[PDB]
Design a protein around this ligand. Structure first.
Ligand SMILES: CN(CC(=O)O)C(=N)N
Ligand SMILES: [Cl-]
Ligand code: NA
Length: 532
């Protein structure tokens, strides 16, 4: 079906499946991460994915207009906008690093194959003997000393990195050119971009399985650690990983639903997209953890300490796989080209959605002469100004605050929980089921309304409560504990995303008159379109 490919290439299959899931699994521990993943996917992931798709189909509108079913909660739309903005702030940053790798890929010998270069510390060696626990692989040296120039901590920003600055600027001007032109990957390149990733990954997997110690890595990836289930860290990471990789709460899924026709088979669409996202994430995990197993066997250090536990694992594992290929530079170019294409597709969708939302928000009186190009130029420039913070020596640290807090973390649980509450307890789960039955003819499984009513909200609330009760300060690469101001800034992002719903609530309550009950009922009266 068109929806399948449109969503896959669009903003469903992307870095969140190839880059995010790997290091989330690595940080939480390989096997133990999978149980909350599948549990949330069956309980929170699939139901909310279906919710957003079919809500977009029903209302035939995206952005905030989709909440005309309950204008009193229209604030969720605003919240989504904020979230996607933060996403667009740091998502592109990954691309910059990837772009940098691509630029350094075109060489007879890859930069991260030998460590005899200038920036590499004397504590390195190309091949490892059976000092111990101190030697650093050339790939991590290239990732940190050169690509990142990682500083002591977030307290010290350091000197700006000009090469990554230029690469990020190139990514942003490319985003500007494509969004303004509206490339949309044509119609056949779409198909190519739908099938180009897996192919490359497949090759890696074959090489991945043909390595010493890849079995240890894969059993670490699969066999759960039953002790770790107690901590809420795994549950928050898995729930937010699904709500990120599925793009839950970012408003693009409602746009996908609106693009679809009213008479469409949305249930099978949602199930197959969930299966594709989960399977692509699982496949990327296969590749990454096979590579980690090979590195653990070759280093001699334990699997849990081989690579960086932060966002850089996808740039530690995947390039190493390329070094194992016969023609290394060609496969480096191919892999990083596919990664760049995936990121650009996702970022095009996100930036286009954000621009459409802003232009919808702004009244007709604020009609700029060049509103399209002016708006996209301002958004790109502002995002670049914010991104200058993540390019600095300590900038990687800020990226973590944009990863754990701005989009993922507590804010996504809050958004999804309020989604469930507004659609099920306010609008009416049974009435919504009747609407779905009218839309698609037949009726979905009762598991869906059970999930929306008192399963997904309860699970999200429980993870939230276990987080706040047993709060742990965020730690980067299990080495650097964040200070109170970094936590404060991350929570500033979190509250900026979360407060959109309660503040818009109080705003509507104040703008309304009379007794609280009657005005709350008036403001929550659904507003129907011409079709229904
Ligand atoms: C745009 N993306 C990337 C992804 O799908 O992982 C969102 N999660 N929204
Ligand atoms: Cl995923
Ligand atoms: Na995804």
């Amino acid at each position: 079906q068109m929806d399948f490919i449109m969503s896959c290439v669009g903003f469903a299959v992307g870095l969140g499946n190839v880059w995010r899931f790997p290091y989330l699994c690595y940080k939480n521990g390989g096997g133990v991460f999978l149980i909350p993943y599948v549990l949330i996917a069956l309980v929170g992931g699939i139901p909310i994915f279906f919710l957003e798709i079919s809500l977009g189909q029903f209302m035939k509108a995206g952005s905030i207009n989709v909440w005309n079913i309950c204008p009193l909660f229209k604030g969720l739309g605003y919240a989504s906008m904020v979230i996607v903005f933060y996403c667009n702030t740091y998502y592109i940053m990954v691309l910059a690093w990837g772009f940098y790798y691509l630029v350094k890929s075109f060489t007879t010998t890859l930069p991260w194959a030998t460590c005899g270069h200038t920036w590499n510390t004397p504590d390195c060696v190309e091949i490892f003997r059976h000092q111990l626990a101190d030697r650093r692989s050339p790939v991590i040296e290239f990732w940190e000393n050169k690509v990142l120039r990682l500083s002591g901590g977030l307290e010290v920003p350091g000197a700006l990195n000009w090469e990554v600055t230029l690469c990020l600027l190139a990514c942003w001007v490319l985003v500007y050119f494509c969004v303004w032109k509206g490339v949309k990957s044509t119609g056949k390149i779409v198909y190519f971009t739908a099938t180009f990733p897996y192919v490359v990954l497949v090759v890696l997997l074959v090489r991945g399985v043909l390595l010493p110690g890849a079995l240890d890595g894969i059993i670490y990836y699969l066999k759960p650690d039953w002790s770790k289930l107690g901590s809420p860290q795994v549950w928050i990471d898995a729930g937010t990983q699904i709500f990120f990789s599925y793009a839950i709460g970012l408003g693009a899924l409602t746009a996908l639903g609106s693009y679809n026709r009213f008479n469409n088979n949305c249930y099978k669409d949602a199930i197959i997209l969930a299966l594709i996202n989960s399977g692509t994430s699982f496949f990327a995990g296969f590749v990454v953890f096979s590579i980690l197993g090979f590195m653990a066997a070759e280093q001699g250090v334990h699997i849990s300490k081989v690579a960086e536990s932060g966002p850089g694992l996808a740039f530690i594992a995947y390039p190493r796989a390329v070094t194992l290929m016969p023609v290394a530079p060609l496969w480096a170019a191919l892999f990083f080209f596919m990664l760049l294409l995936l990121g650009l597709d996702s970022q095009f969708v996100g930036v286009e959605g954000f621009i459409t939302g802003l232009l919808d928000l702004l009244p007709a009186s604020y009609y700029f002469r060049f509103q399209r190009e002016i708006s996209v130029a301002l958004c790109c420039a502002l995002c670049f100004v914010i991104d200058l913070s993540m390019v600095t020596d300590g900038g990687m640290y800020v990226f973590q605050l944009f990863d754990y807090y701005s989009a993922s973390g507590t804010t996504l649980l809050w958004q999804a929980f309020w989604e469930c509450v507004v659609v099920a307890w306010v609008y009416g789960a049974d009435r919504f089921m009747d609407d779905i039955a009218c839309m698609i003819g037949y009726r979905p499984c009762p598991w869906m309304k059970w999930c929306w009513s008192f399963f997904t909200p309860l699970v999200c609330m429980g993870i939230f409560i276990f987080n706040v009760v047993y709060y742990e300060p965020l730690v980067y690469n299990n080495t650097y504990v964040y200070p109170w101001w970094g936590e404060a800034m991350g929570w500033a992002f979190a509250l900026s995303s979360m407060l959109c719903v309660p503040l818009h609530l109080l705003g509507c309550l104040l703008r309304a008159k009379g007794t609280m009950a009657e005005r709350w009922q008036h403001l929550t009266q659904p507003i129907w379109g011409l079709h229904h």
